Design a protein around this ligand. Sequence first.
Ligand SMILES: [Mg+2]
Ligand SMILES: [Mg+2]
Ligand SMILES: [Mg+2]
Ligand SMILES: [Mg+2]
Ligand SMILES: [Mg+2]
Ligand SMILES: [Mg+2]
Ligand SMILES: [Mg+2]
Ligand SMILES: [Mg+2]
Ligand SMILES: [Mg+2]
Ligand SMILES: [Mg+2]
Ligand SMILES: [Mg+2]
Lengths: 59, 59, 96, 126, 136
Amino acid sequence: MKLNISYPVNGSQKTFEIDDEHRIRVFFDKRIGQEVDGEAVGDEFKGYVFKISGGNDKQ
Amino acid sequence: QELEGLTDTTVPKRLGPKRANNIRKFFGLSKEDDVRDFVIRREVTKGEKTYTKAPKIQR
Amino acid sequence: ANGATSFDRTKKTITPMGGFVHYGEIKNDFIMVKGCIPGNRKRIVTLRKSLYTNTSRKALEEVSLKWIDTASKFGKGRFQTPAEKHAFMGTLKKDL
Amino acid sequence: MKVEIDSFSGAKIYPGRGTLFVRGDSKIFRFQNSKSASLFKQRKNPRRIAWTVLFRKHHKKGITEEVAKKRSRKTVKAQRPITGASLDLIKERRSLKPEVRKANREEKLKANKEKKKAEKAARKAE
Amino acid sequence: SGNGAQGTKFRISLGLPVGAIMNCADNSGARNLYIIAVKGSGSRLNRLPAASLGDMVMATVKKGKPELRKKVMPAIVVRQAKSWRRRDGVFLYFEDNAGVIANPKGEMKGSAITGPVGKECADLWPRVASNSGVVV
RNA sequence: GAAUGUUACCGCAAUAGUAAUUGAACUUAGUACGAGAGGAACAGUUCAUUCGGAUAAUUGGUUUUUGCGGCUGUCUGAUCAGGCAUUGCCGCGAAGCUACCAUCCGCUGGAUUAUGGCUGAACGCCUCUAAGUCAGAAUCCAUGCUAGAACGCGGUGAUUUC
RNA sequence: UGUACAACGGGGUAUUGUAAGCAGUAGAGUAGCCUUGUUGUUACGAUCUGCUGAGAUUAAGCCUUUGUUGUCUGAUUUGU
RNA sequence: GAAACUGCGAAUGGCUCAUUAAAUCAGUUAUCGUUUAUUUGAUAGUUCCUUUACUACAUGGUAUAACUGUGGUAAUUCUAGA
RNA sequence: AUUCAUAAUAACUUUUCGAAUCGCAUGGCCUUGUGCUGGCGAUGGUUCAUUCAAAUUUCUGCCCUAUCAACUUUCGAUGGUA
Ligand SMILES: [Mg+2]
Ligand SMILES: [Mg+2]
Ligand SMILES: [Mg+2]
Ligand SMILES: [Mg+2]
Ligand SMILES: [Mg+2]
Ligand SMILES: [Mg+2]
Ligand SMILES: [Mg+2]
Ligand SMILES: [Mg+2]
Ligand SMILES: [Mg+2]
Ligand SMILES: [Mg+2]
Ligand SMILES: [Mg+2]
């Protein structure tokens, strides 16, 4: 899917196209507002932690 | 590690405070520091002429 | 963790709760095979290699199990392990 | 694999166990076994059947706590630039606030200007 | 099934032999469908041709509009009430027997379906899926 | 099941039986072909029909588990706990048995028929045929599967004393 | 005369659905008494609540067993 | 002076005659039986609440749109995160 | 015609309202401070009245049919109390 990531300390924001489904399976069964560690979805985001703030499904 | 679009760059807030007490608490001035000269002015050029167009202080 | 898989990862043997009905325990090595085979329980069974090479895109499928049932076959079993049974039911009068 | 809950008794439903029933109003009921399915069909109230989760909850038996509340005592404490003013400028303005005599100087000059203006108006009339 | 089927279907436990009267789930004006045949059914001595979820049947309208009665039309079974097993292992069943009126190509006579429809029927017939409300 | 020295175990295989079947969808492909209208097939994939052999993890059925609970009438002074009502009746009900009402499984080699061919005379040419020969059907025979001749056979263990 | 077998017993597993007994300021109410209550007491009262997912049953073709108690040389026949 | 917030208005108008036979409606009453934005005219020295610090009255608090930026769906006067 | 208008007592409120709003003009008095006063408006606000309304309402009045003579009242029909 796509990841609309925002860093509000700098106010910056960027989308990342993410493939390779076993790294996006860490997002599954997680509610909006729960925090997930970034090293599971990628070693590029290793040491990061994201809070799920929203999103859009297909359609 | 630092991300290229999120943690490297920064974007400024678009507007400064408009209410007098909002300016006074944004800058931590005083009871009486005459907030009229701590107003954020955004320099803009129409042609070769430039002007600052600060906000109108409210309350 | 004979009955455990990589997805389950709760250590338990292949033996169902209370033992296999009319058989007992599986303290030895075993062959889990899909479906049903002739014979009843406790019967000597001979297992033979295939007499031909079968491709069929069904003989060649690699199988990785996700979960193995270890609930009791002596009834409508609800719990896979006594630990899970205890966690669901809380403490009882026998438990002190 | 997902473990379902019995709609009558609250028992955990492992794969391939029990039955599923779709009522005519498109509502889904799951039963771990024929006992709970038959009780539901006989229209028994689960709140009055002594071994169900609903009964034990209503009668407060074997009470247990999941009582987890997470509240963040979070103050952002973050400072950022504004388009008109850079962070360095903001810091300078915050720094110079104590003991400002600029207000006094301006007031005096301005008071003089007001007096001059009032006089100018009188002169213009005459 | 037959011509207008989009894909195949796993075997569902047959619950509607010939002579069965199922409710009519659409808004065509029919109240029930009396099953007289099953499309694609096999042959066996004394065995009644029986229909399952997602099957195309040939049916008559026993109760309903006079322009719909006294003639044979295709129908599609959308609710089964006899329990059947999916390959994910659930035995499920609806509360009633229901089908909708269709042409031989699979397009519905009506434009709306009341109640739920089966997922196996919705995948097999796309117009049933389009006019269906909730799919289970 | 007597008799093949006795008794035991592991085998061989004469002969006899034998089984799988049919369709749809996707793709090939709106392609070949055709002025157009229309409109295939081979290979591949996913399923299904009829049949067959098992099996009972699950789902459902069955209930003298007379296992637990409930209910009527009467009898045991009452209570408790029971008897009787030809299994008193009702709900649930393990186990066993069982259902295309449940699940699993159902092999690949050779030889041929029709037919199409090769070489090649008869008949200086030609010809699938006469001599010789290639490919070929849900056919046949094997592989495989079931019994094992109670007068078919082999290997091996042990073989009694007061 | 033993990682022996059995009968019991214990544990597990399953079924049902909360045992008898005791207690209660629960209980539609209805009677008696006075020290005429502000839980008045006594009596009766389907039912309710607690002890109590309790009690009962559980191999007869369920699993298991450091427990208890026992059992372990009767008959007939067979030889190249 | 766009946008957007806020306030008004969108219950007027215009159309039709399906229903409706003590219903509508007409003329005549009643509100000592009630609601009423707006117009018009009048009309709130008392409000620091243990009312001595609690309290700024030369005037206290929080958002949020528009906007910037990142986006999703074939599609709608759809909207999400920052 | 009133238990009316209005007023007074004891309280009650989970508490309403009693201007932290906007434009022009900027003048007078001095203890000359950004001191004190100060005009014409705009919007808002409690209640009463008024206006524009609304809702119920009194009396009398409607075509053809008895090949409609009894209708209403379980499930409000007519009245009473709350
Ligand atoms: Mg079983
Ligand atoms: Mg017949
Ligand atoms: Mg043979
Ligand atoms: Mg069978
Ligand atoms: Mg059953
Ligand atoms: Mg059974
Ligand atoms: Mg030739
Ligand atoms: Mg008791
Ligand atoms: Mg209890
Ligand atoms: Mg001993
Ligand atoms: Mg006014």
